[PDB]
Symmetry: D2
């Protein structure tokens, strides 16, 4: 058991195709006791019933100030007073279709970009602010990322939200360090979630479906060890490695679980 006895909060489960669902499943397989958060709760309760073990499901809208202000208290009620968190998983991402997809880069209104940056980047800090007081020293906060160091088609303002998230992670590390807590991001390669498969199937047109297929083919080609977009397990394992006590001198950083694709040009 890699995470034996650890109490880990896991956000971002929407379906059993979510990266967070696999992070939760692998953490439970490694002995961690989970607390799950979710923004449609009826679907969430049905989805999480497919996890190896039972886990309390708390409601969390990262834009709702009341949900965040009460979060530490609601978590303590779920795990019991006298207990604290050893880990936190931020697997939350959102960008309206005006800022991500087929809409031209310049045509995204700032109100939609601002909402995307609030959920995808600012929420990493507001979740750390809420949960650090109830975290044990030696704990770990892990956020999900997708390498934004180079521009690419369709991802557009979500790439901008990820460049902001990377900057936020380095400042969250400064704050988290005071609690003896690490803060890191996992830059994952593309994973065929329900929305990603729908895009490949033509939900966003044949040009967006071709650009995503080209990105996926190129990812597997550049990755020295290959990249299977239908397998979320290598990413979930990497998040568990950062949640464990086996990367204890790593903080404010990014671990690439992308098959090594970002290290190769061709």
């Amino acid at each position: 058991g890699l995470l034996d006895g650890k109490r880990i909060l896991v956000s971002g489960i929407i379906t059993d195709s979510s990266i967070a669902f696999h992070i939760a499943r692998v953490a439970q397989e490694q002995g961690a006791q989970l607390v799950l958060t979710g923004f449609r709760l009826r679907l969430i309760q049905r989805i999480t019933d497919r996890l190896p073990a039972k886990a309390p499901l708390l409601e969390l809208d990262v834009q709702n100030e009341e949900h965040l202000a009460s979060l530490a208290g609601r978590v303590t009620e779920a795990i019991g007073a006298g207990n604290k968190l050893d880990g936190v998983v931020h697997s939350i991402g959102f960008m309206p279709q005006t800022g991500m997809g087929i809409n031209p880069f310049f045509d995204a209104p700032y109100a939609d970009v601002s909402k995307g940056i609030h959920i995808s980047a600012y929420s990493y800090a507001s979740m750390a602010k809420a949960l650090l007081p109830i975290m044990n020293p030696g704990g770990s906060i892990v956020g999900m990322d997708f390498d934004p160091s180079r521009a690419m088609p369709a991802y557009n303002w979500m790439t901008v939200a990820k460049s902001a998230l990377e900057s936020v992670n380095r400042f969250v590390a400064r704050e988290a360090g005071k609690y003896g807590v690490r803060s890191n991001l996992v830059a994952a390669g593309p994973i065929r979630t329900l929305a990603m498969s729908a895009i490949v199937g033509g939900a966003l047109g044949e040009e967006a479906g071709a650009q995503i297929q080209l990105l996926e083919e190129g990812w597997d080609q550049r990755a020295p060890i290959g990249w299977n977009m239908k397998d979320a397990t290598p990413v979930a394992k990497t998040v568990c490695a950062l949640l464990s006590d086996w990367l204890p001198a790593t903080t404010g950083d990014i671990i690439y679980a992308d098959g090594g694709a970002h290290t190769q040009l061709l």
Copy 2:
């Protein structure tokens, strides 16, 4: 004359200590014909009267949708129909004191961070969207930046705004390339503007004044050729080099005018 005959729009002049004032002064010394934009216009008209040559001053609030929608037309009226821009200088930056300065990183409300990101990063794209239709092929768009790849004290959410601006610049390059136009950022070292000198004088307390002095001393120490925070000229010259035809195969990039400080650990 490095910029002989070129028509360059220059935003961001507030006082004669502004980086944009020195960019405008050096561009005029190199033969460029300027169009200046400004967000308190009475002070601006008095300040720009100290420039080597006359230049029309247009009003531009980057958050005002009407100011941006009319900008290309207002610029054409200032330089004359039949004429286009060869360059655009974005020297605009803002972050309320809740997100930059002495306020703790986690205590910045999202509304203030969102406003800071709108002016400091999103506006680089909205200015490029407005001005690219009236730009000549071979033109150049230059934005001002401050290396955000590593976290630091006090700069806090403005560092996050700069990481977002760097990502925006790479997408603006994709769009600008269609017009044969380059888009680059200049990452400058610290420059003693009126606000920066006030901070060193204790406007933000003795701890912020010590952290800024430590940053400035360390910048000059790490810079192999030294760094004079009271001299804006090396930065203004670098912006002019990118505006010229002497860096024609460089776009989506960052040029460091920081004395080389970012290339040295100590």
Copy 3:
């Protein structure tokens, strides 16, 4: 047992203060079966006698073409016919004092620089060439590194050799990927080995000694979680995480075990 059942070759043990000694000790505490290499085998035998468990000790001078030609055969005789290695640890670094220390950067003769790059950078590829034919799919090659992205005092040509090692690692990942094997480096913060503590005491003079002390002190300050030069365990555990099956999608990459110092400016 994090590395239960795994056969791991560990090079670089010279004294009980070497990072390789701590890597070997933690790898054995986690159930791995080791093969040790040495370049003085009688004195290395006494050092490796202090490890929790016994392990076959093979002679390997990375500059000796014959030692590398026979290496795979000598490893198979030590681990059993039909068996393969699951992990390889390169913890070998060398730079004559003409290229590292108080000697001016320009005063390093190329013959010394060449020997330093041969042992520190080329040997990573020649060890992978000799051991990849005898490694299992899912295997892991880990090399030791220090961040050379920014120049610094005294390290001089050792930094250049580390920049070369980073590039070699990315090409070793291309080759290793054909075998299902990962190749990664661990960029550690400064560790007080027998030589580093002597250099601080005055072995290289008061000016270089002050520069090294200032350089090493800045690590603890920049690191959000702190940094203890006297504790090699956080570095050793990070190596064992890369050798395990918990980072299965990371190759051609660098993991920073530096307390997060490289992510902070000050």
Copy 4:
């Protein structure tokens, strides 16, 4: 005249297709007074005869310690006693075909790799060591580079030598800064020199020829402003901008003259 009155040493001219030839031609078109070096001086004399203006041609084999010892004295005899250089251009790269091309990465003997790093990386420092005592404050040393941050087919050990050159540049900046001199590299996209066009035609085989063609074709596609392998002028102008007084605060750095390709994923 961008370089009017400046004395600039230019190494690396072999044929009229060399980047050094175009750098020398553009430098002379901009008013600079040149000093050329060569390693075959009678055949280089005929090539340099095609430049706009005459220039003294000195012999320089970067591996010859005697050529480097006498270099400063031979440059002063050519430019006049009391005079100093304002610029130095290192455009020298070499890697035996065992370390670059179709030979497997692991099959490169170290003797060949060592010679390649000596000419491509070490020679940048040994040229700066010999010429810094005879350079003016405000001077500029420019080396030629290709982006080696990501591995790629065929370039193999030449990429490793470029990673080493990037590190050497940052240390040469520390030393050069003591003289008021800058040191920078220009990372160019692929340029069709006599060798590159022969490799595409089939000199290295159909598999490597296809890989090189695919690699070089991806540059034009990724570059927001496009990329013409047959045009060396954009690279030559970028070098002249670094040699001028228009980038006076940039040192230890890399300027990318690659059409912005390195800033885009696809």
